[PDB]
């Protein structure tokens, strides 16, 4: 549909492509967290460890509602188990306790919501493998504290599972203007930054309220708006009536980045590579210049130094070998 070849010749470079997803009413599950482990009712050599754990739990829970050698060893063994129980619990449900309202669920809590069965999780919630990945990296599966009990220590957490409705064939495309030279003068085109393409249909999108994700765009409602016939004609290929303003008395982007690749204007300013300090091979075949990590890991444009990417070595986690 879009004619990117004649758009590239007026400074517009293809950005990240993303498909359109609308968020419906989320499914809800109640994860009841019995915060007291099922200890034995036997009362020998337990003593005050139970009450110490109770006051430790009180310190956690009140702000939520508000807004003899062997005998000691048995106590110590049960003391550490309760701490391990709480530390494991405070890892699966730590963030929810820290922010009782609208905190994103840990991946362990999401797994515990279905007993570790991701095969069930995808089916009952009607998730494709992509939708779960998008929701995870958009941090959209949240949680809320709805009931705290200070007599029998347990808390129930809503875990909101958003329903990502995906458009039939709509892709959100990022259009990145870059300055280009024409008639021995520097120009820049003025087109919407994010576009909606679904078959022959092109519509404006007000993406600002949405969640931008590497694979898709999550929106709470459809933000598509009708296109003018002139703007569609530009995007179809007839760039002769596409907007373009001179760069005089203004600052304009002379480069754009896409999927780790730099598209540059090297006619207006000199572009070099800091790795070697020499100019980049340039041709009149294209009005814009392309640089990738393969050629230069760090390229300079005028005085703008740009890192195209660099993989440094791995490093081991450092800690004392206590055993």
């Amino acid at each position: 549909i879009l004619h990117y070849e004649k758009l590239s010749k007026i400074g517009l470079v293809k950005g990240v492509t993303r498909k359109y997803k609308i968020k419906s009413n989320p499914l809800t599950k109640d994860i009841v967290i019995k915060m007291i482990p099922n200890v034995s009712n036997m009362s020998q050599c337990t003593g005050s460890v139970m009450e110490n754990y109770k006051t430790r739990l009180n310190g956690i829970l009140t702000p939520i509602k508000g807004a003899k050698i062997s005998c000691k060893q048995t106590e110590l063994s049960l003391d550490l188990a309760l701490s391990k129980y709480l530390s494991d619990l405070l890892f699966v449900f730590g963030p929810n306790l820290q922010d009782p309202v609208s905190n994103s669920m840990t991946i362990q809590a999401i797994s515990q919501a279905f007993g570790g069965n991701y095969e069930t999780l995808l089916r009952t919630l009607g998730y494709a493998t992509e939708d779960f990945d998008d929701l995870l990296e958009s941090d959209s599966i949240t949680g809320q504290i709805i009931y705290v009990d200070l007599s029998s220590y347990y808390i129930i957490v809503r875990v909101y599972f958003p329903i990502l409705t995906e458009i039939q064939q709509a892709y959100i495309q990022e259009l990145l203007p870059v300055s280009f030279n024409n008639d021995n003068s520097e120009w820049i085109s003025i087109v919407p930054n994010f576009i909606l393409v679904r078959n022959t249909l092109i519509s404006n999108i007000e993406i600002g309220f949405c969640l931008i994700t590497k694979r898709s765009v999550i929106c709470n409602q459809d933000y598509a708006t009708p296109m003018t016939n002139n703007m569609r004609e530009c995007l179809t290929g007839s760039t002769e009536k596409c907007p373009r303003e001179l760069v005089v008395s203004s600052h304009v982007p002379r480069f754009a980045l896409s999927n780790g690749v730099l598209f540059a204007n090297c006619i207006s300013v000199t572009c070099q590579c800091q790795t070697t300090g020499r100019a980049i091979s340039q041709s009149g075949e294209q009005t814009l210049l392309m640089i990738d990590n393969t050629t230069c890991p760090t390229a300079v444009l005028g005085n703008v130094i740009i890192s195209l990417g660099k993989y440094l070595g791995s490093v081991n986690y450092n800690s004392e070998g206590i055993a």
Partner: antibody, heavy 121, light 107 residues
Framework: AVQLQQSGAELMRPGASMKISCKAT????????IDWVKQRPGHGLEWIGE????????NYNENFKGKAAFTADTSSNTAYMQLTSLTSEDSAVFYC??????????????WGQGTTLTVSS | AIQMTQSPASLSASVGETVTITCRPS??????LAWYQQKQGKSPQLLVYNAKTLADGVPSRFSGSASGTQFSLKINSLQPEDFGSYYCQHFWSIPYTFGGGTKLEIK
């Protein structure tokens, strides 16, 4: 392209300075970098730096920042290099090489005929 | 600075033998690797300037190959004039690092 002739061998005392030359003909001199590469007689080849005659831009090696200084007389198609703080370790052969126009063209198409810098007491 | 590992330091091959010299940079240099031929009393001469492209005037007996880190230069039907020193050089980053050099001997 046709000739990259250098000035002949010369003798200087340690601690002095010297100026090498390279004459290039047969192409557009102002476009191609002239990179100087050093070769001690027994241990291989070593790079010094480069100079772009048409723009005056230069690049240098860390071991040769103070040891080298370039100059490109485009009016006579002659390159140059100044060497300072010469010692016995600076007595080697210095080669002028036609580097490429742009990045990714650091390979050396043509080389100088070869003259020996001789530093001794 | 990038370092260049070139092996072997010396290489012996007879007349009509097929011989190969390889070099490895300490870091990815892309196809940016060149091979030069040096003999006593003469300047090095460009043979293969990119990873796998022969220079102008180079005999077809010379050829090269490129890998992720491995770069090798292969000579087919070795002739007496093919003796001398072979250098492997990168132009990925400043400063450009030459290899250790290989002395080929005609047998």
């Amino acid at each position: 392209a046709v000739q990259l002739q250098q000035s002949g061998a010369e003798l200087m005392r340690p601690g002095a300075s010297m100026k090498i030359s390279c004459k290039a003909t047969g192409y557009t001199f102002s476009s191609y970098w002239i990179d100087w590469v050093k070769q001690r007689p027994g241990h291989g080849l070593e790079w010094i730096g480069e100079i772009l005659p048409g723009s005056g831009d230069t690049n240098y090696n860390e071991n040769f920042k103070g040891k080298a200084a370039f100059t490109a007389d485009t009016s006579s198609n002659t390159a140059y290099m100044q060497l300072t703080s010469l010692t016995s370790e600076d007595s080697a052969v210095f080669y002028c090489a036609r580097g490429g126009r742009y990045h990714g063209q650091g390979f050396f198409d043509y080389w100088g005929q070869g003259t020996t810098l001789t530093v001794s007491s | 600075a990038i370092q260049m590992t070139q092996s072997p330091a010396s290489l012996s091959a007879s007349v009509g033998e097929t011989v190969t010299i390889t070099c490895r940079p300490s870091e990815n240099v892309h196809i940016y690797l060149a091979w030069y031929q040096q003999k006593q009393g003469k300047s090095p001469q460009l043979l293969v300037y990119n990873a796998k492209t022969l220079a102008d005037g180079v005999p077809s007996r010379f050829s090269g190959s490129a890998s992720g880190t491995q770069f090798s230069l292969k000579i087919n039907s070795l002739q007496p004039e093919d003796f001398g020193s072979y250098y492997c050089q990168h132009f990925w980053s400043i400063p450009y690092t030459f290899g250790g050099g290989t002395k080929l001997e005609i047998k």
